[PDB]
Amino acid sequence: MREVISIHVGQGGIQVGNACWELFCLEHGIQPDGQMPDAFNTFFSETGAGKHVPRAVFLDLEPTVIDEVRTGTYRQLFHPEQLISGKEDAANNFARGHYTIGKEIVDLCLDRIRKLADNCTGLQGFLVFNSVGGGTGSGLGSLLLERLSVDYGKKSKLGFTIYPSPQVSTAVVEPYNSILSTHSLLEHTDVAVMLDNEAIYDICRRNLDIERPTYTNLNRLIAQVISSLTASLRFDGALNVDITEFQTNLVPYPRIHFMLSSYAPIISAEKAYHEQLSVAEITNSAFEPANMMAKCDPRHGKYMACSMMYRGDVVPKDVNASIATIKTKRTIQFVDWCPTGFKVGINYQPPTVVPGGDLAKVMRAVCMISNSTAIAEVFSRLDHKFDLMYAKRAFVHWYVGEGMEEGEFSEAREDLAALEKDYEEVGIET
């Protein structure tokens, strides 16, 4: 009687949704056709006899990815008319997907959301995935969040946004729409998790020893993180954690809800079994700055609160004996007004392996969600990139001619300045 609905918008969102939906189907024993040859209820729904239907909706204005989905092996799984598709792409223009073509599509998505919600009885909250540096992704994510915040109100929404890397970039105009989308979801999303690609590339290179990774390898790690986060809702555990038990433990103030994640262990089968993978060493590896899932240095800032999930055969006393060691270290310092900052969850189900993938099978794993003061650097560098081109008003004509006003750029800049001032104000000791 506990449910959650995941929203996938944009090319990156759909490509990570595919990645998480192989993993969930594999973890619950459901074949790609949707047929089994009481834990499924969190992500799926029973049709009365036979197949299961995911509680997910796919959105995009550009039809190529959806058409690829509707012809692959998973054509029989998803309901045919929840893969909403458009005709014309926003083409990396934020104003397009927020004012011009997204408005005519958003009504169908909201109707689908209502039709899925009326089925659930114990709706925990929503999940949303969107790559920020694109037109349709950021614009439609903003519009959907704004509609949901007023249609439903206090229901919790979680956002797994992928911000651009510090120096590596695929587009040339992504700072503009990244800043605008951050403006939009700052006052509209309860949790936002950092996911830039460069850090995960470094993780793959160093640990998985892959020298030529593709997007699928990144999306599989993200899917594993999602599964670790939501395992506690569908498996028995000695110390459970619910989604609603987050803003009471990781969010000191309503404005501050951007945090960065990490995962451990990450190791290949060729050298995994030569070492014992004790809980102490994995919880040490999870706190290593080089294993952050976002390219930010935690040594440059304080910690505010750490929520970290275990799964497997871990015993609570071993967890406490390792939290003490971390509190001992002099290179990791917490904020003054937080004496204890750890929330611990323990689950029994070990992580599942996907055949043909990178990760091996292990009995212990740890996933941490940590809120730290050091996150302000990404905001500062994105702001610096934005200012350089906004000084000469470059690329603005592509946005003014799509219905957006001239002054809309300035207030996003003011909100980022306010956020940066707030992060500095919080981190000073009393």
Partner: protein, 86 residues
């Protein structure tokens, strides 16, 4: 499994309920039990004459303490190291 303790013996009674997990202790202890006798059996003996230092009467064996139900399994086990340092 949240409410069943990690092992068969509850701390208050420090005892077991029959099934394999309970059985391993009522089994491993039989093994583990045997190992303890041999060093203790050994430690006093290599040093010992076997004959009392003053009386000289032939000494007695330490075999009596272990129960005779497991008397034979202990038998072969002592010999394996008897040959090793034979």
């Amino acid at each position: 499994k949240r409410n069943t303790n990690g092992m068969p013996f509850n701390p208050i009674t420090l005892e077991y309920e029959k099934s394999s997990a309970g059985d391993s202790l009522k089994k491993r202890d039989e093994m583990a039990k045997v190992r303890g006798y041999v060093r203790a059996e050994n430690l006093d003996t290599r040093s010992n004459c076997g004959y009392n230092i003053l009386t000289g009467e032939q000494r007695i064996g330490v075999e009596y303490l272990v129960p005779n139900h497991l008397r034979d399994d202990y038998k072969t086990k002592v010999d394996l190291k008897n040959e090793f340092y034979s």
